[PDB]
């Protein structure tokens, strides 16, 4: 039970696969354009922010962070997110960040 999201280096959702509807209750379009931290419990945000910054810094390495995600039903859902930057095979530029978001 998980869904994949893509983010720019700032954390903004730029793609969300439709499994998010069953996992956290939003439609993809409800997430697109918002930052991931906007769905994070206030106590967990600093850990999420620093983990996201480190994903970008450690280009290509797979990182993991746990945090509470605010579902559409306004409950705090514990989430384990595995993240990595995708590097362009030619330019080595960061195309985007891929997150696998799993309810725990």
């Amino acid at each position: 039970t998980e869904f994949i999201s893509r983010h720019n280096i700032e954390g903004i959702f730029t793609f969300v696969d439709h499994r998010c509807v069953a996992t956290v209750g939003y439609q993809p379009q409800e997430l697109l354009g918002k930052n991931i931290v906007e769905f994070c419990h206030p106590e967990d945000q600093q850990l999420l922010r620093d983990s996201f910054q480190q994903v970008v810094k450690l280009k290509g390495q797979v990182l993991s962070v746990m945090f509470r995600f605010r579902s559409k039903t306004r409950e705090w859902l514990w989430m384990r997110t595995s993240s990595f930057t995708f590097q362009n095979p030619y330019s080595d530029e960061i195309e985007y960040i891929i997150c696998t978001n799993t309810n725990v």
Binding site: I4, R6, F15, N88, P89, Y90, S91, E95, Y96
Partner: protein, 110 residues
Amino acid sequence: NMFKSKHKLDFSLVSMDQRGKHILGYELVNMGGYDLVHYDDLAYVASAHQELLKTGASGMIAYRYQKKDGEWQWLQTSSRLVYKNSKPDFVICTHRQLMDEEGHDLLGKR
């Protein structure tokens, strides 16, 4: 069912046949080469990109490209490096539009 596209070495699109534009539903330039690749096919397409860069050719038997309406289009693509004054210049891709049955069958064989 076949069409071509032209890309920078980093795979960003610089031109595509009008037939390919209408299949995907779109402009298509001003977009990164990986922005429409299905997340389960990213590794497959990136590995072919490396094959193209190191070797000058690559083949992708099946992968998905997101259409304008949000649906996925199964594609089968050969790619080749075009050179200029002995230096790599751009990429030319030749695509075949796959139906979902053939795409899902090829996914397990790739």
